[PDB]
Amino acid sequence: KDFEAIIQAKNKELEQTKEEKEKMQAQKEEVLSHMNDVLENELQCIICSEYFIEAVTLNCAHSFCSYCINEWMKRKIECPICRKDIKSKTYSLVLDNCINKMVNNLSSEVKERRIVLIRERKAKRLF
Amino acid sequence: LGSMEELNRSKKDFEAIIQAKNKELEQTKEEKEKMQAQKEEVLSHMNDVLENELQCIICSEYFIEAVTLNCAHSFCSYCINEWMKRKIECPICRKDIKSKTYSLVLDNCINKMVNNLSSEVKERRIVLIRERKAKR
Amino acid sequence: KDFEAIIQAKNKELEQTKEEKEKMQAQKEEVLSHMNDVLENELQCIICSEYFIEAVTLNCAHSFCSYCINEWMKRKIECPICRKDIKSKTYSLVLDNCINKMVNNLSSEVKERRIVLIRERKAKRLF
Amino acid sequence: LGSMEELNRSKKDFEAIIQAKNKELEQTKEEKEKMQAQKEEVLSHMNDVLENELQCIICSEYFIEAVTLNCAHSFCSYCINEWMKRKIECPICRKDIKSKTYSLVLDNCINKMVNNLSSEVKERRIVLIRERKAKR
Numbered sequence: 003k004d005f006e007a008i009i010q011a012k013n014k015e016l017e018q019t020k021e022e023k024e025k026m027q028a029q030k031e032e033v034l035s036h037m038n039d040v041l042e043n044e045l046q047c048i049i050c051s052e053y054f055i056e057a058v059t060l061n062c063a064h065s066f067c068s069y070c071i072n073e074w075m076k077r078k079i080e081c082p083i084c085r086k087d088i089k090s091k092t093y094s095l096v097l098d099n100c101i102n103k104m105v106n107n108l109s110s111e112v113k114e115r116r117i118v119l120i121r122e123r124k125a126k127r128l129f
Numbered sequence: 130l131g132s133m134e135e136l137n138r139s140k141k142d143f144e145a146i147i148q149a150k151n152k153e154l155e156q157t158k159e160e161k162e163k164m165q166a167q168k169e170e171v172l173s174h175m176n177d178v179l180e181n182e183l184q185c186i187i188c189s190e191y192f193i194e195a196v197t198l199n200c201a202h203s204f205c206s207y208c209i210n211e212w213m214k215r216k217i218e219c220p221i222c223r224k225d226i227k228s229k230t231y232s233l234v235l236d237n238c239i240n241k242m243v244n245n246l247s248s249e250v251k252e253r254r255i256v257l258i259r260e261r262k263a264k265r
Numbered sequence: 266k267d268f269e270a271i272i273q274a275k276n277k278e279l280e281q282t283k284e285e286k287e288k289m290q291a292q293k294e295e296v297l298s299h300m301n302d303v304l305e306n307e308l309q310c311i312i313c314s315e316y317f318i319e320a321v322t323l324n325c326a327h328s329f330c331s332y333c334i335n336e337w338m339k340r341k342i343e344c345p346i347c348r349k350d351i352k353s354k355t356y357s358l359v360l361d362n363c364i365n366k367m368v369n370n371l372s373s374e375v376k377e378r379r380i381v382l383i384r385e386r387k388a389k390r391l392f
Numbered sequence: 393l394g395s396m397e398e399l400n401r402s403k404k405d406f407e408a409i410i411q412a413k414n415k416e417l418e419q420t421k422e423e424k425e426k427m428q429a430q431k432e433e434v435l436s437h438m439n440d441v442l443e444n445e446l447q448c449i450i451c452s453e454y455f456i457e458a459v460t461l462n463c464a465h466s467f468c469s470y471c472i473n474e475w476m477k478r479k480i481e482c483p484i485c486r487k488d489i490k491s492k493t494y495s496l497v498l499d500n501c502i503n504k505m506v507n508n509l510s511s512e513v514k515e516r517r518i519v520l521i522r523e524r525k526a527k528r
């Protein structure tokens with residue numbers, strides 16, 4: 003019987019399974035990285051570092067919490083991020099709804115913190 | 130030790146290597162399937178959000194150049210611009226349109242999430258963007 | 266008795282009264298001219314030539330009837346008057362209320378015409 | 393015709409001139425008072441509108457650089473700009489302020505009407521404009 007051939011076939015099987023695993027790991031890491039980038043870098047208010055609460059979008063296309071941008075605007079009428087003079091504000095149902103859905107998949111600590119801020123800021127639109 | 134015993138130990142030694150390799154193989158498969166599940170769960174989350182929160186109600190596609198109206202509703206720039214050739218009112222709430230604002234956060238979130246989905250999904254979006262920018 | 270002096274005093278009295286009258290006439294004409302200028306040149310919509318109905322003011326500071334500017338905007342997104350790209354609209358309670366008060370002092374023909382257009386355009390804000 | 397008769401006709405001729413002049417004088421006064429009434433009626437109309445429709449609720453003056461908010465309420469530019477240093481909400485309806493738009497029609501109407509009022513009223517406005525533009 004070819005004992006050497008049995009070992010070589012088991013070794014290739016193992017090598018194949020390892021590369022499959024390493025690929026799946028890189029794919030997993032890439033997706034999570036991208037998800038976290040969205041959470042941390044797109045959906046967090048630059049003024050308060052929280053996920054937007056009652057998101058408002060300015061004429062310059064940047065978004066902020068309603069509470070945050072109003073406090074800012076009492077002192078300065080330039081977008082915090084791009085410094086263009088602020089000419090319009092609008093609330094964004096889609097951003098609020100997207101954020102609620104995303105946050106719903108996070109830890110109950112994160113979820114409860116968000117609830118506390120919402121009530122603390124009297125953020126009515128998030129019923 | 131005599132051939133029957135020497136044969137038996139050589140068999141045990143060979144089998145121990147095979148079994149060590151099968152244990153590694155099995156464990157590697159389990160780690161692979163775990164990361165596959167972890168990946169799929171995040172992909173499921175992205176699909177849920179994209180399909181149920183980030184689709185334009187007019188075209189049913191993920192927003193392409195998302196714009197937000199004064200009434201807080203959002204649409205593709207193309208779709209609302211076509212709508213406004215006939216009615217200056219929100220397709221959803223029918224309030225008079227007073228302002229239209231591009232939303233970078235919506236666009237970046239969509240672009241970043243879609244980048245993780247299949248080639249078929251990514252390509253459709255690229256085609257749709259090209260179609261909408263094309264001259265007519 | 267000085268008959269010549271009686272005639273001269275009556276003549277001066279008359280001359281004084283005539284100049285007073287001519288001054289009052291010029292003042293009267295000036296005020297009316299200004300009132301009509303406001304009515305005809307400030308409070309009339311350039312698109313429909315009616316006193317504004319449901320006045321809307323654009324980012325460029327020009328005002329139009331709501332109905333008129335919406336029809337315009339289906340075809341062009343430039344202010345009719347200054348041709349700047351339209352970026353915002355807002356209704357104006359003060360303009361509507363001012364116009365109602367002014368029109369209230371005009372003929373019942375003008376008042377009834379305005380009522381007809383309001384209902385014809387379904388101009389809700391003017392209850 | 394004899395002196396009594398010649399005297400009498402000379403008296404009648406003199407009196408006829410005086411009476412013709414008094415008739416003219418009386419008629420001229422009536423035309424003057426009529427135009428005075430016509431003028432005052434238009435001035436009353438302007439005052440009614442200015443006082444009851446074109447005053448800023450914050451300062452009680454006729455609007456100086458009128459601005460209109462998204463909620464359709466108007467204020468002086470100076471007054472709303474000062475208010476917004478403390479609250480980003482309409483002083484009248486308390487809605488969140490989303491836009492602030494200068495209104496040429498309001499400004500031109502005020503300027504044109506005020507130009508017909510007393511020197512005292514016109515001067516106060518000029519002073520107030522100067523005060524608000526002054527550095528501080």
Ligand SMILES: C[C@H](CCC(=O)N(CCCNC(=O)[C@H](O)[C@@H](O)[C@H](O)[C@H](O)CO)CCCNC(=O)[C@H](O)[C@@H](O)[C@H](O)[C@H](O)CO)[C@H]1CC[C@H]2[C@@H]3CC[C@@H]4C[C@H](O)CC[C@]4(C)[C@H]3C[C@H](O)[C@]12C
Nearest residue numbers: 186187188189190207208210211212213214215216220265
């Ligand atoms: C969209 C319409 C076809 C479908 C249709 O024929 N109806 C609408 C059905 C709804 N579905 C969609 O629109 C789809 O999402 C598409 O946009 C789809 O995404 C495309 O494949 C992508 O490009 C029905 C016709 C009536 N339309 C209405 O939308 C209803 O009246 C309704 O909304 C009510 O007004 C409202 O709900 C109140 O109850 C077609 C038919 C005629 C087209 C206009 C021709 C003249 C002008 C040419 C200019 O160069 C562009 C502007 C345009 C005004 C045109 C716009 C648009 O192109 C029209 C309306």
Ligand SMILES: C[C@H](CCC(=O)N(CCCNC(=O)[C@H](O)[C@@H](O)[C@H](O)[C@H](O)CO)CCCNC(=O)[C@H](O)[C@@H](O)[C@H](O)[C@H](O)CO)[C@H]1CC[C@H]2[C@@H]3CC[C@@H]4C[C@H](O)CC[C@]4(C)[C@H]3C[C@H](O)[C@]12C
Nearest residue numbers: 449450451452453470471473474475476477478479483528
């Ligand atoms: C207006 C206030 C004095 C009168 C006052 O002391 N109160 C308001 C009374 C209302 N009357 C008026 O404002 C008048 O119309 C004046 O504006 C008048 O026209 C001037 O003579 C013309 O220049 C009471 C204090 C509380 N203020 C309120 O307005 C109430 O809280 C009320 O509105 C409620 O918030 C609301 O109704 C909710 O119920 C004074 C007192 C302290 C001042 C701030 C100091 C610090 C900052 C300096 C900056 O360089 C400019 C910004 C500023 C935030 C200042 C703004 C303003 O200058 C203030 C508020």
Ligand SMILES: [Cl-]
Nearest residue numbers: 085086087088
């Ligand atoms: Cl700027």
Ligand SMILES: [Cl-]
Nearest residue numbers: 348349350351
């Ligand atoms: Cl422009």
Ligand SMILES: [Zn+2]
Nearest residue numbers: 047050067070
């Ligand atoms: Zn914030």
Ligand SMILES: [Zn+2]
Nearest residue numbers: 062064081084
């Ligand atoms: Zn910005």
Ligand SMILES: [Zn+2]
Nearest residue numbers: 185188205208
């Ligand atoms: Zn769309």
Ligand SMILES: [Zn+2]
Nearest residue numbers: 200202219222
């Ligand atoms: Zn809407």
Ligand SMILES: [Zn+2]
Nearest residue numbers: 310313330333
């Ligand atoms: Zn009009």
Ligand SMILES: [Zn+2]
Nearest residue numbers: 325327344347
């Ligand atoms: Zn204009």
Ligand SMILES: [Zn+2]
Nearest residue numbers: 448451468471
């Ligand atoms: Zn004021």
Ligand SMILES: [Zn+2]
Nearest residue numbers: 463465482485
């Ligand atoms: Zn208001």
